[PDB]
């Protein structure tokens, strides 16, 4: 299934990659690392397709906290760039409300005076 997933990714069929990766999580049984990798892959393809709710649901199911934080960083950035700020407000971050403020502060101060919407 990991081989067929690489093939479907190279052909550019993200809906089928999500379906197959969901089946492959069933076979991954006790390997939490493979489950983390497959769920990170499902998150990425849902995010790329603009399926914000399903991407958020996939992110909450990631067992690896390090990958979950990197997926959370990617979700926050992509939704901010797409101007989908309402969904981002609705999404219930756990103890990571100050990670968002720290990221936007790090970018804000790091970036030039010409404002956009990070400060807003």
């Amino acid at each position: 299934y990991n081989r067929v997933l690489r093939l479907l990714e190279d052909v550019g069929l993200p809906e089928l990659v999500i379906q197959l990766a969901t089946i492959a999580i069933g076979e991954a049984s006790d390997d939490w690392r493979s489950q983390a990798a497959l769920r990170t892959r499902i998150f990425k393809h849902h995010l790329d397709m603009g399926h914000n709710n399903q991407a958020y649901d996939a992110l909450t199911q990631i067992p690896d906290p390090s990958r979950q934080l990197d997926c959370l960083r990617q979700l926050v950035v992509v939704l901010c760039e797409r101007s989908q700020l309402q969904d981002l407000v609705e999404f219930p971050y756990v103890n990571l409300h100050n990670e968002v403020v720290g990221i936007i502060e790090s970018r804000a101060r790091a970036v030039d005076l010409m404002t956009h919407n990070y400060y807003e």
């Binding site: 969901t22 069933g26 649901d57 996939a58 219930p92």
Partner: protein, 251 residues
């Protein structure tokens, strides 16, 4: 004689008649393991029976004989609607939810009936595939599928993991109705859900309702839990602006 008279039946497929006879010849062969050169093995060659049907009937015979591994290996060999439901229900009755999931993932049977969709949801839930079961409920009947999802998550102890999901306003309204109706423990879970969603007014009003209903409750463990719940919410109530306190204290 009663077996052979099946061949005289009109408007029956010949292969279905041969299927009953083959299934019967397998029972006879199994009754006599000690002679390898039985003329009985010539039956499929003598009546031009496809090797495909042979393996399928062997698979069904092995299933009724409690050899589920070799049964599935015969049926899955590369060489009906009611059979899908019965195979899945049989595998679930025996506790082998993993083989029921394997079967469902490979064969992908079309769930046409509310019974088949509830069956497929139960296979997915028994394998901890909650997100797939949840998506299947949304795809297929929405009140019945959500009811089945919430009842099975409550029976399996998965309600805390369900509360971590993203709900639509409709799914959320139905979850609130379900958790309000289904006992005092589910009203404490609904309180936790309101707190996790920053819905502090609804959490405080629900706790006032629970404070009024528990004035006669002996039980030591429920009394200690209600004491802790009351203390936490009385701390949140102190932090609220005077106006929000008034709105929370106005019945």
């Amino acid at each position: 004689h009663a077996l052979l008279d099946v061949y005289l039946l009109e408007n029956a497929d010949e292969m279905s008649k041969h299927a009953i006879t083959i299934y019967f010849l397998l029972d006879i062969m199994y009754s006599f393991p000690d002679k390898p050169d039985s003329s009985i093995e010539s039956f499929p060659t003598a009546f031009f029976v496809p090797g495909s049907l042979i393996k399928l009937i062997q698979g069904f015979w092995l299933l009724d004989h409690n050899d589920y591994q070799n049964s599935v290996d015969c049926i899955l060999n590369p060489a009906m609607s009611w059979q899908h439901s019965q195979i899945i229900e049989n595998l679930l009755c025996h506790g082998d939810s993993r083989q029921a999931l394997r079967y469902l993932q490979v064969m992908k049977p079309v769930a046409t009936t509310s019974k088949e969709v509830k069956l497929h949801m139960t296979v997915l839930l028994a394998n901890r595939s909650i997100l797939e079961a949840w998506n299947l409920q949304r795809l297929h009947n929405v009140e019945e599928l959500l009811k089945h999802m919430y009842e099975m998550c409550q029976e399996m102890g998965l309600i805390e993991e369900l509360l971590k999901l993203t709900f639509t306003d409709f799914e959320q309204g139905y979850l609130h109705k379900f958790l309000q109706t289904t006992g005092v423990q589910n009203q404490e879970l609904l309180l936790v859900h309101h707190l996790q969603r920053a819905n502090y007014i609804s959490a405080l009003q629900l706790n006032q309702s629970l404070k009024t209903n528990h004035l006669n409750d002996c039980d030591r463990r429920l009394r200690e839990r209600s004491g802790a719940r009351n203390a936490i919410l009385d701390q949140y109530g102190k932090i609220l602006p005077r106006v929000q306190r008034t709105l929370a204290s106005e019945r």
